[PDB]
Amino acid sequence: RALDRLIGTWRVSGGAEGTVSYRGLEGGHFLLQDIALEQFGQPVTGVEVIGRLKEFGAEEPGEDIRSRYYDSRGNTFDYVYELDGDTLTIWGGEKGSPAYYRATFSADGNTLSGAWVYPGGGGYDSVMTRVA
């Protein structure tokens, strides 16, 4: 429920250009992100479902909040979300991965600015601005 901050429509700049939306799913266990982006001029879209995984017949959900991102090009990417105060961390695959997004919400919760980190290209800056 701490990911409620993400609910809304955001313009995205840096690494990609466009807009994304987060809506909570009924029951409040999963966030649905809709992605409408451009990268190198080409359209890049998909969805991502954010929440803990829980096996039917388990008492407790998973320890990690998780997501799977399904994109227009046919790839699937798995993340782990951590929100610790105003800092969001999105890990590729598992907490502590060499590739991750880290960003901080502005004091008004309307701007989330940070950067992707990974070996090779190093990463790149990204900012989201709440727009609706």
Side-chain angles (χ1 to χ4, degrees), residues 2-132:
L3 299 186
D4 216 69
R5 334 194 45 169
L6 295 177
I7 297 199
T9 307
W10 303 72
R11 175 95 197 168
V12 172
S13 203
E17 297 287 300
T19 68
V20 303
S21 275
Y22 301 83
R23 87 175 155 110
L25 254 294
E26 174 127 55
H29 280 103
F30 299 98
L31 219 58
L32 184 97
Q33 193 195 174
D34 205 67
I35 293 89
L37 297 182
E38 267 173 11
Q39 226 169 21
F40 307 96
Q42 270 323 91
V44 157
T45 55
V47 284
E48 176 183 15
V49 184
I50 308 157
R52 308 178 180 289
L53 302 193
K54 198 221 295 224
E55 285 151 353
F56 189 56
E59 278 209 312
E60 317 226 314
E63 268 44 71
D64 308 80
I65 303 180
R66 281 196 193 270
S67 83
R68 173 158 297 151
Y69 163 81
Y70 314 74
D71 91 336
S72 54
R73 300 176 270 159
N75 298 292
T76 53
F77 305 137
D78 285 349
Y79 298 102
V80 176
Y81 280 69
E82 268 177 304
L83 198 79
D84 167 46
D86 277 353
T87 302
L88 179 57
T89 313
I90 303 187
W91 305 97
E94 301 293 347
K95 170 136 166 203
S97 150
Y100 63 89
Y101 183 71
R102 208 190 281 304
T104 303
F105 287 95
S106 62
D108 41 308
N110 272 342
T111 283
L112 174 69
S113 63
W116 278 95
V117 175
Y118 47 86
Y124 57 88
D125 312 317
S126 222
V127 65
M128 299 171 55
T129 293
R130 201 194 262 110
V131 152

